[PDB]
DNA sequence: GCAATCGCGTATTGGCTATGGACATCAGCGG
DNA sequence: CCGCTGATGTCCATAGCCAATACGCGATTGC
DNA sequence: AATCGCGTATTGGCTATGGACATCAGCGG
DNA sequence: CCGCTGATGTCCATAGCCAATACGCGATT
């Protein structure tokens, strides 16, 4: 009656990849993967030793799929862009494997996936430097990260364009980002922790900072209450003296980020009245907030699925309203850009800003915020052609 | 058995004053006052036309009590500060009568109460100008408001000092505030509504602004969902497509103000490391937030009793932590001041900033924020002598 | 092309609390 | 001591208001 | 001079899931 | 009809989230 397909491992791996993409590593039970393949958990143990081994196999398979879709001597970015775009469109879902799921692996696998990502970014940087021969290494790295984040932003949503419109949009955005002239010399800053200790002036602030750091480093389901308490110097019952629960801490982080973004948007709107100056002010405020609180940005990017329904819905609605304001300004500045193209460009720019803000070594230069804002504005305005 | 004291209306008025001070005018029923006076509700109608007449009588009685406590040619502030301080210490619980309960009266009674308050402030300004005869009208008005707000702050909490320490503290604070040299000139601002309209970029923002304005103008129990919907341009039931309930708007306003204050405090802490500059930066951030959002300040001052328990508790705890940071800085700068004196001075400065921020005609000058910050710092630092 | 959403006026609806009429009782006074 | 007209308490009910949630009606958008 | 909540460190559950013996087919000779 | 490969039954171990109880405070009425 029941037959062994002799390819059980491939089916189990495919189901695990799908479930990890959809719901996450901790929220997907082994029996869920087994049922998706019409087996039980002990069959998976017959095929894989551990659940973590299954996750590592899934992440490696996703990276191999991206590499195969990518399909030697470095060539100008204009020559390689079409291939890069095709690969990106085909692999849009799998971004979370390396970006979020890989967070849960052991040190060796994390180092391996980090090496793969760094090699990809280095190839993109080589292409960018071949496109513009006269560029400082920091500027070349920034433009390479801009191109990479623009290509990777497709995995943060489900929007698309009919026909070859999406490819044209991505090509224009990447080429405009790459060919942006430098705005400052970008000198390395002398190289903080004292300011970080000073800004934790209460037990509530210390617990909030410890929770945000632990959520960014490990993940919400993987952080104990005792870990947050130790970060604050107490036990978990101390955290429950200060908070109602850990979901309360997550909701507090999300609400704090939302309110800060709203305040910066209000200030930017009140400061300027013309379209260009207003868009520049909004981009500058977003960059400022992203650079000042990388942990909040990382939490909002990753752990949003574990927050309360009302908090998540409100945060998403407010972000959508601010993005709609951005799209209206973009459409005013560039009449050719439509609304779908506008939101695609806005998502790409936001992804670039957030990705650069989280990386530490990219933000160790004087006046890097101006460069980030200029690159984001170039990406947003690339719709002109 | 039952006895009619023939002075029943005086006891009814006393109980009404006590209940109006303790809790809101809308939060006490006529049955509560009647029970406190040992009578039934219609017995009150035998002595008063309605509840609004009783409220007006209570407010007039409180103002008359303050006037009697105070008791010609104006005298220098140093020769009248003893009397004013005594009057304030005696009338501290009565202040809310002409500050919150006044909004529920008729137009004529509101104008009469405003006239009484303005006459008191004008007498204070005359005393201040007699003390320092080298001040422009704007500076004299600002210093008079500083003194009046210091006394009103003393009439805002339950803190006190043993013996004549409180009188000495208030005298020093008022004299330091009055004797502050002008920080800068105050040219009248050329005279927006355009900035008040574009910042409402979504239905949620419009509803929030309308709710805040209505709560400030009338009070939380006196505003129904119909007015908020009309301010947003929709029907009353349409408000629930964006909010869970009417209390959700108040909770959102309180949370927004708390997060904005927290962000400004964090920025001020990170900007400066020395004690004096750090305290100046904290005061400047508080002044900036108070001046930019007067409606939020008014809501937090008045309608806080109608918010959720958790939201109110969190807001109070965060404000207490920030004020504790202020008190630590004050104690570092001035070794003489103790913790309780620091609490009193911080309350005085905060009340001064909030009172000046809410008044519209006082803020129509160029660089008034610097003068407000200077006066607040003069109040806070006072205590060296 | 058509069904699933989506705002948006209206329409109820279950408290809830100022008022209020009918009736009742103390107050001191004038024989 | 005792009626005897003021003034001053109760007892129970009613009317209007005000969250908050039902409908139905249109217009739009994914399939 | 009692009297008090205020933190603080264990303490004890209740509940999910990951992993695992024992039995179990199937699938090529 | 047989020896290897895969599967299915329950089952237990153990971690993690909230309460609950314990003494000291150090300030409060």
């Amino acid at each position: 009656v029941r037959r062994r397909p002799k390819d059980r491992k491939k089916q189990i791996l495919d189901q695990a990849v799908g479930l990890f993409i959809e719901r996450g590593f901790h929220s997907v039970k082994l029996e869920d993967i087994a049922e998706a393949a019409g087996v039980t958990a002990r069959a998976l143990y017959r095929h894989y030793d551990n659940k973590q081994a299954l996750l590592a196999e899934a992440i490696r398979t996703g990276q191999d799929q991206y590499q195969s879709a990518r399909r030697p001597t470095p060539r100008p970015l204009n020559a390689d862009l079409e291939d890069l775009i095709a690969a990106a469109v085909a692999s849009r879902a799998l971004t979370v494997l390396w970006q979020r799921e890989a967070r849960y692996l052991n040190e060796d696998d994390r180092t391996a996936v980090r090496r793969r990502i760094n090699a990809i970014v280095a190839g993109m940087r080589d292409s960018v430097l071949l496109e513009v021969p006269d560029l400082s290494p920091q500027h070349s790295e920034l433009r390479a990260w801009a191109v990479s984040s623009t290509l990777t932003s497709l995995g943060r949503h489900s929007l698309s364009l009919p026909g070859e419109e999406l490819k044209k949009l991505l090509y224009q955005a990447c080429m405009a980002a790459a060919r942006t002239p430098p705005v400052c010399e970008l000198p390395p800053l002398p190289a903080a922790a004292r300011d970080e200790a000073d800004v934790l002036f209460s037990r509530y602030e210390t617990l909030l900072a410890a929770g945000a750091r632990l959520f960014r480093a490990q993940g919400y389901p993987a952080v104990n209450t005792s870990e947050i308490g130790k970060g604050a110097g107490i036990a978990g019952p101390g955290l429950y003296r200060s908070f109602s629960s850990k979901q309360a801490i997550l909701d507090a982080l999300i609400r704090r980020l939302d309110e800060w973004r709203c305040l910066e948007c209000i200030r930017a709107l009140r400061a300027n009245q013309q379209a260009a100056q207003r868009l520049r002010g909004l981009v500058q405020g977003h960059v400022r907030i992203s650079l000042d609180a990388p942990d909040l940005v990382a939490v909002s990017v990753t752990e949003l699925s574990h927050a309360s329904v009302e908090v998540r819905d409100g945060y998403l609605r407010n972000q959508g309203d601010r993005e709609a304001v951005w799209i209206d300004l973009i459409g005013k500045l560039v009449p050719a850009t439509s609304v779908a193209q506008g939101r695609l460009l806005v998502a790409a720019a936001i992804s670039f800003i957030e990705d650069v803000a989280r990386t530490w070594h990219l933000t160790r230069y004087a006046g890097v915020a101006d460069e980030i804002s200029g690159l984001a504005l170039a990406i947003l305005t690339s719709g002109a052609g």
Side-chain angles (χ1 to χ4, degrees), chain A residues 1-70 72-193 195-309 311-385:
Chain A
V1 191
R2 300 187 178 181
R3 334 219 72 80
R4 327 272 199 252
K6 155 190 325 293
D7 52 74
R8 272 294 196 204
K9 221 168 79 166
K10 260 297 300 302
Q11 318 209 6
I12 290 161
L13 185 69
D14 292 358
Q15 297 306 319
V17 163
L19 285 157
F20 290 157
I21 291 300
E22 194 178 1
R23 294 193 281 127
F25 175 76
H26 297 277
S27 313
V28 164
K29 289 158 50 58
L30 265 189
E31 85 155 65
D32 283 359
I33 304 137
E35 185 202 36
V39 286
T40 56
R42 286 291 279 109
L44 321 181
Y45 286 96
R46 204 60 90 164
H47 291 295
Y48 300 82
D49 39 322
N50 289 345
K51 188 185 178 193
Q52 192 174 55
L54 189 37
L55 172 73
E57 224 58 41
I59 291 165
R60 167 170 336 122
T61 298
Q63 292 206 286
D64 289 350
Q65 283 184 42
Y66 173 84
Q67 197 92 310
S68 95
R70 177 57 202 284
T73 64
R75 52 178 174 179
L77 187 80
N78 60 80
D80 221 344
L81 253 181
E82 281 81 11
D83 315 75
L84 288 165
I85 291 166
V89 173
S91 306
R92 54 190 300 173
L94 317 164
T95 57
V96 296
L97 286 176
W98 49 88
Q99 291 175 339
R100 174 190 64 184
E101 310 289 324
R103 289 149 72 220
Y104 315 137
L105 290 176
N106 55 75
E107 66 287 334
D108 297 354
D109 307 5
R110 292 211 313 263
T111 49
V113 307
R114 235 201 308 290
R115 269 193 334 242
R116 308 266 291 271
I117 302 161
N118 289 5
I120 293 181
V121 183
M124 249 165 241
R125 169 195 210 162
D126 290 351
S127 290
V128 170
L129 194 53
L130 272 177
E131 178 81 19
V132 191
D134 47 349
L135 227 44
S136 183
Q138 35 258 60
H139 289 95
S140 300
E141 224 198 348
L142 262 196
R143 277 138 186 79
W145 273 80
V147 170
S148 178
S149 308
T150 291
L151 289 175
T152 313
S153 89
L154 288 188
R156 294 233 71 218
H157 52 70
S158 266
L159 318 159
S160 174
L161 287 189
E164 307 273 278
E165 297 178 20
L166 189 59
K167 168 216 153 273
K168 218 172 307 298
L169 195 65
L170 294 175
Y171 187 87
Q172 288 164 2
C174 292
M175 279 300 291
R179 267 189 315 220
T180 285
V183 317
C184 56
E185 307 315 305
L186 224 56
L189 49 74
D195 291 299
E196 167 62 1
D198 291 302
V199 300
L200 313 176
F201 49 83
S202 70
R203 168 146 301 170
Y204 184 84
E205 295 290 305
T206 304
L207 278 161
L208 222 59
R213 185 211 323 131
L214 290 171
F215 294 161
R216 179 197 185 165
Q218 287 165 253
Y220 175 84
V223 172
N224 303 0
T225 60
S226 66
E227 272 179 86
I228 309 146
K230 158 186 202 45
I234 59 188
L239 172 166
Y240 290 102
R241 283 204 300 289
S242 293
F243 290 85
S244 180
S245 45
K246 45 189 317 211
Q247 193 178 64
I249 320 183
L250 195 44
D251 293 358
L253 298 171
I254 300 297
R255 286 198 185 112
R256 166 168 302 199
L257 183 68
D258 198 12
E259 296 303 325
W260 290 7
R261 299 276 205 212
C262 167
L263 170 61
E264 276 295 330
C265 178
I266 281 173
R267 291 211 211 195
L269 282 173
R270 194 172 290 137
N272 295 284
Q273 252 71 45
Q274 313 298 334
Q277 283 86 358
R278 193 124 76 174
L279 194 54
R280 176 172 283 281
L282 290 168
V283 171
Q284 282 172 355
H286 200 281
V287 168
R288 187 177 188 181
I289 286 299
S290 292
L291 280 185
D292 288 4
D295 288 354
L296 289 190
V297 170
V299 154
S300 71
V301 161
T302 46
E303 316 306 313
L304 195 65
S305 163
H306 306 283
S308 175
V309 169
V311 181
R312 180 196 322 126
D313 283 0
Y315 171 77
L316 291 178
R317 196 232 302 118
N318 299 328
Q319 210 49 54
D321 294 335
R322 296 192 288 266
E323 276 151 34
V325 173
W326 285 36
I327 296 158
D328 187 16
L329 276 177
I330 291 176
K332 227 159 288 203
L333 279 172
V334 183
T337 311
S338 75
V339 181
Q341 304 178 354
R343 49 174 46 108
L344 277 161
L345 291 177
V346 161
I350 295 301
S351 274
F352 158 68
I353 293 172
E354 294 176 325
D355 289 4
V356 164
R358 296 199 299 257
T359 305
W360 190 77
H361 73 273
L362 288 171
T363 73
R364 304 312 301 172
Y365 309 87
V368 75
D370 280 38
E371 269 284 330
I372 297 165
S373 295
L375 288 181
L377 277 170
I379 290 175
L380 288 184
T381 305
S382 65

